[PDB]
Paper text:
The question of the effect of point mutation of the other catalytic residue, E517, has not been answered before. The ArthβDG_E517Q exhibited no catalytic activity, whereas activity of mutant ArthβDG_D207A was severely depleted. As expected of the mutation of the catalytic residue, E517 into glutamine caused loss of function of the enzyme. Mutation of catalytic residue E517 into glutamine resulted in the elevation of the melting temperature of the mutant in respect to ArthβDG by 3.5–5 °C, depending on the investigated buffer solution. In the case of 50 mM sodium phosphate pH 6.0, it attained 49 °C, which means that it was higher by 4.5 °C compared to wild-type protein. The structures of ArthβDG mutants: ArthβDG_D207A and ArthβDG_E517Q, were solved proving that the point mutations within the active site of ArthβDG have no destabilizing effect on protein’s structure. In the case of ArthβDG_E517Q, only a slight change in character of the active site was observed —similar to previously studied loss of function mutant ArthβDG_E441Q. The inactive mutant E517Q was designed specially to enable binding of transglycosylation product—lactulose, in the active site of enzyme and thus elucidating the mode of its binding.
Numbering used by the authors:
A (entry chain A), B (entry chain A): 22 to 1010
């Protein structure tokens, strides 16, 4: 019979296993003096729902365009109202049947008219730095070719096709193609021509490609320099000039520069250079550095380095995969400002302009090829393109374009084959190709744990325990003795760790101590730098971030795309403030007697001469003493004890007992740097003189009794419930025990440890911890002092359908001014439910007050939140914030905002002030309840109800990283137990 | 110190382990000529939230009532806006810490003024037939006592307290008490004075209690009669008269009536009798029957009986636990009309008036004590009141009041100790007490499988397989040899089986065949008779039923209270129509040659003389022949072959081949009965002459091709998709394969069989069956006949992120009038997901039509729905219903309304008619999509969208009873497989 379906030819091309056709050889991205014209700007665009209905109406000519409208290019076109973004993590959004594509496949036709002056003849090309996922390119109706590899560059010769004057460039882009099966990164699906489009003249006697080789001999101090230059794939005559080093040499010859200052992330020394032929000159920035593996350590310039890293996706909350240059520069500065020294380009090459900025600002870069096949894992990796010989040419092409583009940049210290792509013959082919092309950079790939085709051993989210075993070289052996010996000689990197989703990440300090202890450990890269929030404006014009499912997706992964150290607009999350402290490159340990501090220089290359060392003593009234102390430069990996002026110690000795005072020593930048202004804080340490325990008020005030109320000084109690209804005139609507919090993203994750396959959030719901009930057992007034009395209220807390509970006793006392509150908690019954021991989130009290709080002040840790396994960046001091600024604007609202280690607190309720003191407690204050917080999926769902929710916790659980990787470490868990704690309360005007 | 809490005395009483205080001895409910006054009517009512704030303001006197309002009594007070109903199944709504009660405990103060004439002096009492859960009673300010046992009667002597003329009765009712721990039935929590309140004069020389003993000697035909009569607990002189039997005897003497007609559910013969003393006469209805266990069979009057039973809760959708008498009478008639002969009073004694109606209409009754402690199971039965000696007196009191009230009623054939109360010493004490008081009725209790203290072996939801083993006496042995021998000599009853929640129950026929095969099997009681829906009126005034969670409950069990054979207003569900057929008491097997039918009388006592046997032959045009055939009475458990008139067989022989005709033989009531009018259908059987296969149209019409459309006779196809866009001018918006349906309540239940602990609904979601995607592979026109052509469209169906699929090929053909459609389905890949084989709900097609359907007609099974393991009550015939009447109004919308076994169908779309024919298919038609159906939680969420959703299924899965008990039996499951089926389509005006 006769074939009748439509669009079969277009679909066959989209199903191609091969790389793009018609492109020039892959090469470096080079700054050249050749004439160039950027075609970025306002293009014309038409969208069709699939190949079979994509018109074949000659639109490529620009004449009588039917159905086109203006669209910026570069762009991710769903960010501009054409379709919508869609988020999946691992799962494909289409049926898995490679190489076939779904019928619903957005086809975007792009068209731009431009003018080519005489400087673009006789030879020129068109460059495309990124098209997701399949491009077909026509110029003046003539097909140039196709693009595969969404984040890779393609160039097409236009000689004999480009015309003098007006030209018409047409590009048909398909969202889905066979290449989608190898681009399954955990991120938004966003088609478009999302990077630069450039016309570049190719003058005769020019330079097509350049390969910089700039090594460093750390013994002699020599630089080893060879700059290759080619045209049409052939080495050519060219002259290399490096003026700062008094150098003129031929391209292609290796020389020995007697002395060079070596490049590192800490000291990113770059030498300006130019390589030029008769027709073209290329400008280079040369950093001399050598990379080697020896004694199972990753070494640069002869030294083991510590990677303080993040995984960087490219995302912008309004432009999608288009990241404006100013945002790139700003976020790299922000990384440096938080002590980061390393970046993994998860999981594809970045915009080409990123490389020079990393060279300049100083980051160790893991440059990763555009390859991920994670969605094949759930079928046992059946049909995985990574092990399918039909995909070999396509995957080698991806690696070749990755390597060729960025090979000249000192910041790149490892090539990565891809991410979560299983094991297979094509990964081996990619590795062999890279090792042969560029032996100067070790190869990284986590997906094959046997590490057969790599030079470093990489894992993601390995526990602190397994990392310690690896650090000692005693992890279990591979079955193959030869492969085991190879891997045991490799250094070890965590390419992803301490998953930073929501409240968290907990457990960072335990990893860092191992990094410092064991040379084989290279460090780690946090997952991830940024949340992929997409800005949404609601009915009222109130902006907030959207995540998976908020754009009508049929299958999605929710807020797992919002898992970053900064939000999509680069505002730090608390996790980044903690991370900065965890990875600080200097350690400052202040002596308890305030005579001095131990200073350890944790850097690998630089001394301490860039830093100014400042001290300040702060007390309740303010600063009492402070200044700068001169420190002879301390070498990398060396230590010294720095004396503080005698006045500081003398001040500590004269302090009256119980008066709190904090000595803080900081290392700040002595001068402006390329990434921060002078005075920027890099490291700090403290010694605290703690306030004395608040003496409980003498119980000299008696209990006065009325039919329905009891009064004890400034406290009024309901006689029916035994609970206070007001304290100093502040209405108390509720007081009770808490054991639960609104689950974090981590609490919604499964702990793949133990026989319990429920997330902690589910364990808590099953146990009833979110719906506690209180029974009153009795109320008694007991003799106090000089006619005074204490009031003891006995209660039992439990939950419907449960037999376990806790006996909670409140003992109240007052001298008329201060109120004393002792709370005693005693376990009743066995706290087991559905066969497993119940764990608590906290041991604390919730005060619900009938008035709003405008201001929260405290002495403790701050300014930001802290939980048992977080809060490293929260330092001791006196803090005060408006109520709203106590919250944390996580995209999915969740437990957050607790200030652990508080010794005193003050809430301003309009005109009066409520003061809380006692042994250390955690402090949280909110204008809405925990049930409202738990129910809210986006921040607009949070609405104040005119009350104050005050949380005073005697104990808290950690937050961990159970959303992906380890849960809460054993020492931070909270099993049911007896407890007792004392508070004082005071209300003033 | 000094005690200061409030209300401690009230709470201490509520925590009492003891029975109520102050009541007269428990006795029978008796029809007496003693003067009586019902105090039912409009009372005054005040509600307090708990004991500690319940006023002690002297309200018991009726003077200056502060805060009282009118309330009907009897009532469940949350049904009248005081609080709200709350539904839990097993879980308690309060902390489990017996005997303690929560602080939130509705306290209802009831008050009524009444007048007592001289006939109520000097002696009278007040009777309360039910108070949930704790009552305290005052008369004229004087405390009478308290009530415990919510569904049990209490009487208080008011001699010397009742006054001539005006009196004031005050009752304080607490919702929760220690007794709540032993009243954990799966039902709504509903406090109130919910049964009659009566003043009764007690004249001197009267009769307090009566115990009827009326046995039957099945050998001699004698009745064995002894009527005991007592006053103040002492046997008294009284005369018993039974006029119909020519009897006058003294109370307390056993006599032998020479001949009596025995009582059974089938023939509920009752003799009017009176026992009288000088001061009082009591009217009785005496049914002579004897109960015995012999040869491991439960026998009445010397015959093993088959229980065709339901579990009857007391519920009314607007009045709660108050069931108006007219509703009781109507629903018992409805039970008889659906062949039911047995009732279990789950799980408490019914209203006292129920007993006489069961005597009269004829049901075997399992009368169950008010005891259930199910909520202790989840803590390993720790603290279970059933094994706590401190609860012995309270639990024996419950059993004593249960037995004493109803002991005179022939319909009661077993006493049940309670339900789901574990095992324990107090259950044994209850059994010992009952066996001693009334040896004439065997004891039932399912909670102790060892059956130590019972006379029958009872289970709930035992599988058909285990029931077959029990029926053969080869179930596994108990560890105790003595207890094993006892239990193996017991008959076996399913006190609850074939859970009737939502679409279902499936698997009824397999149980019934075992009941018929094995004498040891007594039968079973369906769970349950009625859905406990509560009527709710929404914003627009649209009524619907609410279930758990719809009334603000903190903990609840959702729609598990809507699990009945009839809805709360007693409208039959399809399950009741199927059940009636399953348990029909006669079997009618029509010969294939239409010469006669085999008639088996499945009754235990009655012959067939109450029935008229009618036949009718029906064809497309209408009835062709019919009449009545005289049948000599067939004895119980006997069989005969009844000849039909020769004209019927002659008609079958003359039928042209392929013409459909149905011979139906019915057994209807020959005369009015007490429960249905003459002509009521009891049993039926059929023989069908099936229509010949529709010959496919000759493919003489060719495919005409256009740029974007293909036309083949009356079918227009999209050339882009290959699917029809119209058939005979009827718009087709979508056509595709189906494998999924909107989960039933059963599909949301876990199959505790196999290693997969996901409900089927979850298995389907995980597998993507609800989100199928279709890829087009090709379209071809092939040579047909005489220039005609067929059109074959090749597709593959799968789901996002899955590698398995099905190849689906559509072959279209037409002669211009009729359209032929062949569908071929071929498995592609292994249909396994998350480690388990995927199961399908169906193999079918969904047509989405762009116009509404007003009427659906078909030849097949009807009128109601049928699935592979249901539809017994759906008979063969021609049916036609408005679209809305094809649906089933389940409270939670779910898959329903399929008509299996359809051979032809006709949809009326405005003016035109769409006809479907072919080999048997299942037919479903809806005005909304499956996704709308699945998302809808209540019926108002269903909204028509102006389309027609037509489902034609080649195969369906069964529905089972997985919500509670067995899932779908193996033979009704649907594993992925290849399939092929043919349809013809025709559109007319
Ligand atoms: Na991934
Ligand atoms: Na993520
Ligand atoms: Na939330
Ligand atoms: Na139960
Ligand atoms: Na139920
Ligand atoms: Na539904």
């Amino acid at each position: 019979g006769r074939s009748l379906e439509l669009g079969a030819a277009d679909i066959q091309d989209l199903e191609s296993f091969e790389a793009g056709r018609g492109a020039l050889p892959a090469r470096a991205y080079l700054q050249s003096d050749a004439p160039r014209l950027s075609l970025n700007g306002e293009w014309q665009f038409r969208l069709s729902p699939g190949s079979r209905v994509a018109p074949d109406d000659g639109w490529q000519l620009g004449e009588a365009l039917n159905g086109f409208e203006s669209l910026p290019v570069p762009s991710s076109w769903p960010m501009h109202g054409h379709g919508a973004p869609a988020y999946t993590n691992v799962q494909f959004p289409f049926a898995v049947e490679p190489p076939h594509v779904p019928e619903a496949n957005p086809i975007g036709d792009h068209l731009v008219v431009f003018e080519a002056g005489p400087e673009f003849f006789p030879h020129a090309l068109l460059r495309f730095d990124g098209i997701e996922s399949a491009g077909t390119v026509w110029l003046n109706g003539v097909e140039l070719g196709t693009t595969r590899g969404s984040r890779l560059a393609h160039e097409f010769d236009v000689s004999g096709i480009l015309e003098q004057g007006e030209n018409t460039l047409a590009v048909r882009v398909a969202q889905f193609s066979a290449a989608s099966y190898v681009e399954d990164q955990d991120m938004w699906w966003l088609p478009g021509i999302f990077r630069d489009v450039t016309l570049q003249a190719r003058p005769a006697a020019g330079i097509d490609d350049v390969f910089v080789h700039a090594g460093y001999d750390h013994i002699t101090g020599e630089g080893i320099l060879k700059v290759e230059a080619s045209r049409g794939g052939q080495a050519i005559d060219a002259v290399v000039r490096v003026p700062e080093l008094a150098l003129e040499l031929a391209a292609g010859t290796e020389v020995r520069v007697p002395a060079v200052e070596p490049w590192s992330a800490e000291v990113p020394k770059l030498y300006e250079a130019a390589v030029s032929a008769a027709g073209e000159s290329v400008a280079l920035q040369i950093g001399f550095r050598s990379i080697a593996i020896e004694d199972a350590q990753f070494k640069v310039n002869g030294r083991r380095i510590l990677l303080r890293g993040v995984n960087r996706h490219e995302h912008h909350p309004r432009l999608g995969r288009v990241v404006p240059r100013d945002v790139v520069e700003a976020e790299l500065r922000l990384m440096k400002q938080h002590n980061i020294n390393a970046i993994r380009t998860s999981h594809y090459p970045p915009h080409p302009q990123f490389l020079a900025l990393a060279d300049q600002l100083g980051f160790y870069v893991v440059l990763e090829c555009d390859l991920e096949t994670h969605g094949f894992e759930s079928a046992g990796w059946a049909q995985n393109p990574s092990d399918d010989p039909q995909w070999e040419d396509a995957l080698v092409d991806r690696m070749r374009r990755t390597v060729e583009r960025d090979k000249n940049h000192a910041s790149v210290v490892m090539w990565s084959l891809g991410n979560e792509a299983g094991t297979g013959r094509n990964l081996a082919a990619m590795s062999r190709w890279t090792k042969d092309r560029d032996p100067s950079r070790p190869i990284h790939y986590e997906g094959d744990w046997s590490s057969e085709h790599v030079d470093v051993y990489s894992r993601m989210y390995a526990s602190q325990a397994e990392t310690a075993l690896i650090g000692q070289g005693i992890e279990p052996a591979l079955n193959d003795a030869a492969l085991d010996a190879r891997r045991r000689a490799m250094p070890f990197v965590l390419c992803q760790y301490v998953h930073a989703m929501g409240n968290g990440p907990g457990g960072m300090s335990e990893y860092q101590a191992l990094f410092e202890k064991y040379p084989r450990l290279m460090g780690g890269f946090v997952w991830e730098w940024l949340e992929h929030g997409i800005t949404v404006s609601t009915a009222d014009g109130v902006d907030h971030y959207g995540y998976g499912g908020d754009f009508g997706e049929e299958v999605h992964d929710g807020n797992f795309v919002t898992d970053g150290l900064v939000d999509a607009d680069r505002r730090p999350r608390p996790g980044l403030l903690d991370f900065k402290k965890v990875i600080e490159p200097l350690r400052i340990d202040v002596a308890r007697d305030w005579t001095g501090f131990t200073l350890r220089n944790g850097q690998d290359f630089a001394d301490t001469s860039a830093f100014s060392f400042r001290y300040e003593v702060e007390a309740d009234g303010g600063a009492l003493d402070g200044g700068t102390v001169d420190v002879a430069p301390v070498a990398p990996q060396s230590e010294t004890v720095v004396e503080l002026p005698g006045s500081v110690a003398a001040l500590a000795a004269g302090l009256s007992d119980g008066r709190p005072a904090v000595l803080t020593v900081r290392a700040v930048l002595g001068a402006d740097s390329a990434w921060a202004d002078a005075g920027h804080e890099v490291a700090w340490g403290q010694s605290v003189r703690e306030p004395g325990a608040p003496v409980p008020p003498a119980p000299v005030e008696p209990v006065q009794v009325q039919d329905s109320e009891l009064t004890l000084g400034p406290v009024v109690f309901s006689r029916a419930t035994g609970m206070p209804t007001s304290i100093g005139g502040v209405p108390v609507e509720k007081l009770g025990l808490t054991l639960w919090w609104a689950p974090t993203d981590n609490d919604l994750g499964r702990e793949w440890g133990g026989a319990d396959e429920r997330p902690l959030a589910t364990q808590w719901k099953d146990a009833g911890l979110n719906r506690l009930h209180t029974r009153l057992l009795g109320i008694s007034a007991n003799p106090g002092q000089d006619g005074g009395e204490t009031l003891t209220v006995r209660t039992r807390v439990s939950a419907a359908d449960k037999q376990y509970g806790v006996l909670v006793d409140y003992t109240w006392s007052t001298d008329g001014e201060t109120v004393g509150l002792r709370t005693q908690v005693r376990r009743d019954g066995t706290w087991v439910n559905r066969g497993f021991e119940v764990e608590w989130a906290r041991i604390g009290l919730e005060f619900v007050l009938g008035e709003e709080t405008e201001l929260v002040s405290w002495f403790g840790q701050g300014p930001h939140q802290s939980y048992p396994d977080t809060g490293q960046g929260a330092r001791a001091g006196w803090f005060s914030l408006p109520l709203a600024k106590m919250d944390v604007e996580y995209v999915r609202p969740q437990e957050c905002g607790a200030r652990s280690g508080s010794r005193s607190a003050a809430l301003q309720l309009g005109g009066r002030t409520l003061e809380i003191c006692g042994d250390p407690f955690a402090l949280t204050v909110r204008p809405y309840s925990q049930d409202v917080l738990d129910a809210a999926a986006h921040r607009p769902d949070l609405k104040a109800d005119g009350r104050t929710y005050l949380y005073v916790d005697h104990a808290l659980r950690g937050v961990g990283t159970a959303a992906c990787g380890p849960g809460v470490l054993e020492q931070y868990r909270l099993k049911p137990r007896d407890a007792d704690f004392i508070l004082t309360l005071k209300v003033r005007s």
